[PDB]
mmCIF file of all heavy atoms in Angstrom:
data_model
loop_
_atom_site.group_PDB
_atom_site.id
_atom_site.type_symbol
_atom_site.label_atom_id
_atom_site.label_comp_id
_atom_site.label_asym_id
_atom_site.label_seq_id
_atom_site.Cartn_x
_atom_site.Cartn_y
_atom_site.Cartn_z
ATOM 1 N N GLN C 78 90.941 88.368 83.711
ATOM 2 C CA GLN C 78 91.537 88.359 82.363
ATOM 3 C C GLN C 78 92.638 89.376 82.248
ATOM 4 O O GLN C 78 93.689 89.074 81.582
ATOM 5 C CB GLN C 78 90.449 88.585 81.318
ATOM 6 C CG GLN C 78 90.935 88.374 79.883
ATOM 7 C CD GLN C 78 91.401 86.910 79.583
ATOM 8 O OE1 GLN C 78 90.935 85.990 80.228
ATOM 9 N NE2 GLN C 78 92.342 86.773 78.664
ATOM 10 N N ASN C 79 92.484 90.534 82.842
ATOM 11 C CA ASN C 79 93.535 91.541 82.842
ATOM 12 C C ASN C 79 94.850 91.118 83.522
ATOM 13 O O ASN C 79 95.918 91.253 82.917
ATOM 14 C CB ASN C 79 93.038 92.889 83.387
ATOM 15 C CG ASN C 79 92.366 93.785 82.338
ATOM 16 O OD1 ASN C 79 93.007 94.654 81.794
ATOM 17 N ND2 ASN C 79 91.101 93.515 82.088
ATOM 18 N N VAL C 80 94.711 90.629 84.743
ATOM 19 C CA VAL C 80 95.893 90.339 85.498
ATOM 20 C C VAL C 80 96.607 89.093 84.987
ATOM 21 O O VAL C 80 97.831 88.980 85.077
ATOM 22 C CB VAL C 80 95.630 90.233 87.074
ATOM 23 C CG1 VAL C 80 94.984 91.485 87.610
ATOM 24 C CG2 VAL C 80 94.779 89.008 87.428
ATOM 25 N N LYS C 81 95.870 88.169 84.405
ATOM 26 C CA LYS C 81 96.517 86.979 83.833
ATOM 27 C C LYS C 81 97.217 87.285 82.477
ATOM 28 O O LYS C 81 97.990 86.422 81.994
ATOM 29 C CB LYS C 81 95.547 85.802 83.764
ATOM 30 C CG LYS C 81 94.641 85.697 82.546
ATOM 31 C CD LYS C 81 94.071 84.293 82.428
ATOM 32 C CE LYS C 81 93.479 84.088 81.053
ATOM 33 N NZ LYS C 81 93.018 82.655 80.853
ATOM 34 N N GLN C 82 96.960 88.467 81.896
ATOM 35 C CA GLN C 82 97.573 88.857 80.652
ATOM 36 C C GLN C 82 98.831 89.776 81.007
ATOM 37 O O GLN C 82 99.421 90.309 80.037
ATOM 38 C CB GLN C 82 96.650 89.691 79.804
ATOM 39 C CG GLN C 82 95.764 88.855 78.833
ATOM 40 C CD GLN C 82 94.727 89.652 78.115
ATOM 41 O OE1 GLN C 82 93.635 89.109 77.814
ATOM 42 N NE2 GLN C 82 94.956 90.949 77.870
ATOM 43 N N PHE C 83 99.237 89.849 82.236
ATOM 44 C CA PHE C 83 100.342 90.706 82.622
ATOM 45 C C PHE C 83 101.625 90.229 81.938
ATOM 46 O O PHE C 83 101.902 89.045 81.834
ATOM 47 C CB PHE C 83 100.535 90.755 84.158
ATOM 48 C CG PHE C 83 101.663 91.682 84.592
ATOM 49 C CD1 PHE C 83 101.526 93.085 84.544
ATOM 50 C CD2 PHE C 83 102.844 91.160 85.035
ATOM 51 C CE1 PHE C 83 102.549 93.905 84.967
ATOM 52 C CE2 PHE C 83 103.921 91.978 85.441
ATOM 53 C CZ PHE C 83 103.745 93.356 85.389
ATOM 54 N N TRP C 84 102.441 91.167 81.444
ATOM 55 C CA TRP C 84 103.671 90.929 80.801
ATOM 56 C C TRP C 84 104.598 92.114 80.911
ATOM 57 O O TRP C 84 104.184 93.188 81.346
ATOM 58 C CB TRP C 84 103.446 90.618 79.282
ATOM 59 C CG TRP C 84 102.767 91.741 78.510
ATOM 60 C CD1 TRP C 84 101.475 92.068 78.499
ATOM 61 C CD2 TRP C 84 103.428 92.656 77.613
ATOM 62 N NE1 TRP C 84 101.258 93.120 77.651
ATOM 63 C CE2 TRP C 84 102.454 93.513 77.135
ATOM 64 C CE3 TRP C 84 104.791 92.842 77.245
ATOM 65 C CZ2 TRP C 84 102.746 94.577 76.228
ATOM 66 C CZ3 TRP C 84 105.073 93.885 76.354
ATOM 67 C CH2 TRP C 84 104.087 94.741 75.836
ATOM 68 N N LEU C 85 105.869 91.929 80.582
ATOM 69 C CA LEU C 85 106.892 92.935 80.694
ATOM 70 C C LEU C 85 107.710 93.045 79.371
ATOM 71 O O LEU C 85 107.912 91.971 78.764
ATOM 72 C CB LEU C 85 107.777 92.687 81.921
ATOM 73 C CG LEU C 85 107.298 93.084 83.302
ATOM 74 C CD1 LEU C 85 108.496 93.035 84.286
ATOM 75 C CD2 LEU C 85 106.669 94.465 83.300
ATOM 76 N N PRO C 86 108.177 94.226 79.053
ATOM 77 C CA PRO C 86 108.968 94.418 77.808
ATOM 78 C C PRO C 86 110.201 93.492 77.704
ATOM 79 O O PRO C 86 110.450 92.892 76.681
ATOM 80 C CB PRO C 86 109.456 95.921 77.904
ATOM 81 C CG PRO C 86 108.511 96.499 78.820
ATOM 82 C CD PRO C 86 108.091 95.495 79.824
ATOM 83 N N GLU C 87 110.967 93.363 78.827
ATOM 84 C CA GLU C 87 112.135 92.552 78.885
ATOM 85 C C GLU C 87 112.007 91.101 78.398
ATOM 86 O O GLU C 87 112.972 90.452 78.085
ATOM 87 C CB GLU C 87 112.685 92.584 80.306
ATOM 88 C CG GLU C 87 113.551 93.841 80.659
ATOM 89 C CD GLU C 87 112.767 95.153 80.623
ATOM 90 O OE1 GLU C 87 111.660 95.176 81.200
ATOM 91 O OE2 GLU C 87 113.249 96.100 79.992
ATOM 92 N N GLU C 88 110.784 90.558 78.389
ATOM 93 C CA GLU C 88 110.538 89.178 78.031
ATOM 94 C C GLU C 88 110.843 88.846 76.611
ATOM 95 O O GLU C 88 111.190 87.755 76.248
ATOM 96 C CB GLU C 88 109.091 88.807 78.404
ATOM 97 C CG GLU C 88 108.741 88.865 79.894
ATOM 98 C CD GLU C 88 107.318 88.377 80.173
ATOM 99 O OE1 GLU C 88 107.010 87.212 79.917
ATOM 100 O OE2 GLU C 88 106.502 89.223 80.646
ATOM 101 N N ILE C 89 110.699 89.873 75.723
ATOM 102 C CA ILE C 89 110.940 89.684 74.294
ATOM 103 C C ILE C 89 112.278 90.389 73.962
ATOM 104 O O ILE C 89 112.467 91.579 74.162
ATOM 105 C CB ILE C 89 109.819 90.335 73.384
ATOM 106 C CG1 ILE C 89 108.410 90.046 73.925
ATOM 107 C CG2 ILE C 89 110.004 89.925 71.915
ATOM 108 C CD1 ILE C 89 107.985 88.565 73.968
ATOM 109 N N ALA C 90 113.210 89.554 73.476
ATOM 110 C CA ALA C 90 114.492 90.087 72.973
ATOM 111 C C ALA C 90 114.289 90.774 71.624
ATOM 112 O O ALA C 90 113.777 90.154 70.700
ATOM 113 C CB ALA C 90 115.549 88.987 72.893
ATOM 114 N N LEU C 91 114.741 92.016 71.493
ATOM 115 C CA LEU C 91 114.422 92.783 70.271
ATOM 116 C C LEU C 91 115.548 92.807 69.208
ATOM 117 O O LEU C 91 115.275 93.113 68.055
ATOM 118 C CB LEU C 91 114.080 94.246 70.619
ATOM 119 C CG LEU C 91 112.617 94.415 71.115
ATOM 120 C CD1 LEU C 91 112.414 95.849 71.497
ATOM 121 C CD2 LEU C 91 111.635 93.964 70.073
ATOM 122 N N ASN C 92 116.739 92.481 69.595
ATOM 123 C CA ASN C 92 117.919 92.703 68.684
ATOM 124 C C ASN C 92 117.861 91.998 67.370
ATOM 125 O O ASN C 92 118.374 92.501 66.342
ATOM 126 C CB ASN C 92 119.207 92.417 69.453
ATOM 127 C CG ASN C 92 120.345 93.347 69.021
ATOM 128 O OD1 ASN C 92 121.389 92.850 68.534
ATOM 129 N ND2 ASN C 92 120.215 94.611 69.272
ATOM 130 N N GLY C 93 117.250 90.809 67.330
ATOM 131 C CA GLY C 93 117.119 89.989 66.130
ATOM 132 C C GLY C 93 116.237 90.557 64.994
ATOM 133 O O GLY C 93 116.171 90.019 63.933
ATOM 134 N N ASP C 94 115.534 91.673 65.294
ATOM 135 C CA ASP C 94 114.776 92.358 64.318
ATOM 136 C C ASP C 94 115.627 93.113 63.272
ATOM 137 O O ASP C 94 115.238 93.371 62.195
ATOM 138 C CB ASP C 94 113.825 93.405 64.961
ATOM 139 C CG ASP C 94 112.524 92.776 65.374
ATOM 140 O OD1 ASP C 94 112.310 91.555 65.143
ATOM 141 O OD2 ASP C 94 111.698 93.485 65.930
ATOM 142 N N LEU C 95 116.842 93.438 63.688
ATOM 143 C CA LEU C 95 117.797 94.150 62.847
ATOM 144 C C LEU C 95 118.160 93.350 61.593
ATOM 145 O O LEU C 95 118.605 93.903 60.551
ATOM 146 C CB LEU C 95 119.088 94.512 63.640
ATOM 147 C CG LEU C 95 118.879 95.552 64.734
ATOM 148 C CD1 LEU C 95 120.138 95.754 65.519
ATOM 149 C CD2 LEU C 95 118.289 96.889 64.216
ATOM 150 N N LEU C 96 117.954 92.014 61.677
ATOM 151 C CA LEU C 96 118.223 91.081 60.566
ATOM 152 C C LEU C 96 117.156 91.139 59.451
ATOM 153 O O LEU C 96 117.407 90.657 58.336
ATOM 154 C CB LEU C 96 118.347 89.640 61.119
ATOM 155 C CG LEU C 96 119.288 88.632 60.501
ATOM 156 C CD1 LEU C 96 120.728 89.106 60.433
ATOM 157 C CD2 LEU C 96 119.223 87.329 61.348
ATOM 158 N N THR C 97 115.980 91.741 59.730
ATOM 159 C CA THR C 97 114.960 91.960 58.669
ATOM 160 C C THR C 97 114.834 93.455 58.382
ATOM 161 O O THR C 97 114.469 93.834 57.240
ATOM 162 C CB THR C 97 113.648 91.330 58.924
ATOM 163 O OG1 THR C 97 113.193 91.575 60.295
ATOM 164 C CG2 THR C 97 113.772 89.820 58.782
ATOM 165 N N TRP C 98 115.029 94.284 59.450
ATOM 166 C CA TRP C 98 114.925 95.766 59.338
ATOM 167 C C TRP C 98 115.888 96.325 58.225
ATOM 168 O O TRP C 98 115.462 97.166 57.446
ATOM 169 C CB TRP C 98 115.213 96.408 60.678
ATOM 170 C CG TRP C 98 115.232 97.893 60.690
ATOM 171 C CD1 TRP C 98 116.308 98.674 60.711
ATOM 172 C CD2 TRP C 98 114.076 98.758 60.619
ATOM 173 N NE1 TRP C 98 115.916 100.035 60.730
ATOM 174 C CE2 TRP C 98 114.577 100.097 60.640
ATOM 175 C CE3 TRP C 98 112.692 98.553 60.557
ATOM 176 C CZ2 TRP C 98 113.669 101.198 60.637
ATOM 177 C CZ3 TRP C 98 111.825 99.632 60.509
ATOM 178 C CH2 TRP C 98 112.318 100.911 60.563
ATOM 179 N N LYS C 99 117.072 95.824 58.200
ATOM 180 C CA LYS C 99 118.075 96.216 57.231
ATOM 181 C C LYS C 99 117.684 95.950 55.790
ATOM 182 O O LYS C 99 118.243 96.553 54.844
ATOM 183 C CB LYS C 99 119.427 95.555 57.526
ATOM 184 C CG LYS C 99 120.433 96.471 58.242
ATOM 185 C CD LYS C 99 120.033 96.834 59.665
ATOM 186 C CE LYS C 99 121.075 97.727 60.365
ATOM 187 N NZ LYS C 99 122.421 97.034 60.483
ATOM 188 N N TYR C 100 116.762 95.019 55.587
ATOM 189 C CA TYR C 100 116.328 94.642 54.222
ATOM 190 C C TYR C 100 115.077 95.392 53.699
ATOM 191 O O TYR C 100 114.676 95.177 52.576
ATOM 192 C CB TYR C 100 116.146 93.151 54.071
ATOM 193 C CG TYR C 100 117.402 92.359 54.409
ATOM 194 C CD1 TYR C 100 117.303 91.193 55.182
ATOM 195 C CD2 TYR C 100 118.673 92.796 53.959
ATOM 196 C CE1 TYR C 100 118.446 90.460 55.469
ATOM 197 C CE2 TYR C 100 119.812 92.040 54.268
ATOM 198 C CZ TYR C 100 119.677 90.900 55.011
ATOM 199 O OH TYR C 100 120.830 90.130 55.332
ATOM 200 N N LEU C 101 114.462 96.246 54.558
ATOM 201 C CA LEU C 101 113.344 97.070 54.119
ATOM 202 C C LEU C 101 113.796 98.321 53.372
ATOM 203 O O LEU C 101 114.894 98.875 53.624
ATOM 204 C CB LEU C 101 112.423 97.458 55.332
ATOM 205 C CG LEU C 101 111.966 96.412 56.327
ATOM 206 C CD1 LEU C 101 111.133 97.035 57.375
ATOM 207 C CD2 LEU C 101 111.208 95.297 55.617
ATOM 208 N N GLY C 102 113.007 98.740 52.396
ATOM 209 C CA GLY C 102 113.250 100.002 51.668
ATOM 210 C C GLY C 102 113.042 101.172 52.583
ATOM 211 O O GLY C 102 112.521 101.115 53.683
ATOM 212 N N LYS C 103 113.454 102.395 52.111
ATOM 213 C CA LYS C 103 113.342 103.620 52.810
ATOM 214 C C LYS C 103 111.947 103.960 53.143
ATOM 215 O O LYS C 103 111.603 104.394 54.266
ATOM 216 C CB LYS C 103 114.041 104.786 52.092
ATOM 217 C CG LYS C 103 115.511 104.554 51.873
ATOM 218 C CD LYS C 103 116.062 105.610 50.894
ATOM 219 C CE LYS C 103 117.468 105.254 50.404
ATOM 220 N NZ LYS C 103 117.838 106.094 49.254
ATOM 221 N N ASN C 104 111.020 103.786 52.203
ATOM 222 C CA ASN C 104 109.611 104.074 52.370
ATOM 223 C C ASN C 104 108.967 103.157 53.444
ATOM 224 O O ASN C 104 108.154 103.628 54.276
ATOM 225 C CB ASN C 104 108.748 103.965 51.108
ATOM 226 C CG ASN C 104 108.993 105.171 50.144
ATOM 227 O OD1 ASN C 104 109.219 106.330 50.603
ATOM 228 N ND2 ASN C 104 108.862 104.977 48.862
#
Side-chain angles (χ1 to χ4, degrees):
Chain C
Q78 190 63 28
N79 272 263
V80 304
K81 86 164 196 173
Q82 273 172 211
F83 181 75
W84 61 281
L85 279 194
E87 279 64 48
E88 297 182 63
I89 318 297
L91 282 177
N92 215 242
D94 275 359
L95 295 176
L96 213 56
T97 48
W98 177 254
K99 258 70 178 298
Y100 303 138
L101 308 180
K103 298 168 193 167
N104 284 329

